[PDB]
Amino acid sequence: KAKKVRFYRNGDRYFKGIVYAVSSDRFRSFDALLADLTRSLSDNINLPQGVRYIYTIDGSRKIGSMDELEEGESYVCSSDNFFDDVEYTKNVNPNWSVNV
């Protein structure tokens, strides 16, 4: 019942995302997911206040619940209430292995 979703960091052109297996069984709440994403995506140059917002890869909308997440889709994690429309990148030959 878990959904394979790719997460990127806002404004990072070099980072190719991390694959998560998402379900309400793995994460108690959406905050619990944002807490886990803060640990795995945050670093010295990225995410100053950790993961506080999730955007669709085109930055058209913000994701507020686990249900809003679609299987195999890519999302952008941010510390700020704005989307950095940078050229996000993927491998030419995929790797959809969970990192979770």
Swiss-Prot record:
Disease implicated: Lissencephaly, X-linked 1: A classic lissencephaly characterized by intellectual disability and seizures that are more severe in male patients. Affected boys show an abnormally thick cortex with absent or severely reduced gyri. Clinical manifestations include feeding problems, abnormal muscular tone, seizures and severe to profound psychomotor retardation. Female patients display a less severe phenotype referred to as 'doublecortex'. Subcortical band heterotopia X-linked: SBHX is a mild brain malformation of the lissencephaly spectrum. It is characterized by bilateral and symmetric plates or bands of gray matter found in the central white matter between the cortex and cerebral ventricles, cerebral convolutions usually appearing normal.
Protein name, as recorded: Neuronal migration protein doublecortin
Domain of life: Eukaryota
Protein role: Microtubule-associated protein required for initial steps of neuronal dispersion and cortex lamination during cerebral cortex development. May act by competing with the putative neuronal protein kinase DCLK1 in binding to a target protein. May in that way participate in a signaling pathway that is crucial for neuronal interaction before and during migration, possibly as part of a calcium ion-dependent signal transduction pathway. May be part with PAFAH1B1/LIS-1 of overlapping, but distinct, signaling pathways that promote neuronal migration.
PTM annotation (Phosphotyrosine): residues: 20
Organism this protein belongs to: Homo sapiens
Domain Doublecortin: 3-89
Subunit structure: Interacts with tubulin. Interacts with USP9X.
Cell compartment(s), UniProt: Cytoplasm; Cell projection, Neuron projection
Effect on the protein of changing residue 39 to G: In SBHX; mild
Modified residues (Phosphoserine): 24, 40, 60, 65
Reported impact of residue 50 to A: In LISX1 and SBHX
Tissues where the protein occurs: Highly expressed in neuronal cells of fetal brain (in the majority of cells of the cortical plate, intermediate zone and ventricular zone), but not expressed in other fetal tissues. In the adult, highly expressed in the brain frontal lobe, but very low expression in other regions of brain, and not detected in heart, placenta, lung, liver, skeletal muscles, kidney and pancreas.
Post-translational events: Phosphorylation by MARK1, MARK2 and PKA regulates its ability to bind microtubules. Ubiquitinated by MDM2, leading to its degradation by the proteasome. Ubiquitinated by MDM2 and subsequent degradation leads to reduce the dendritic spine density of olfactory bulb granule cells.
Residues of the full protein shown: 51 to 150 of 365
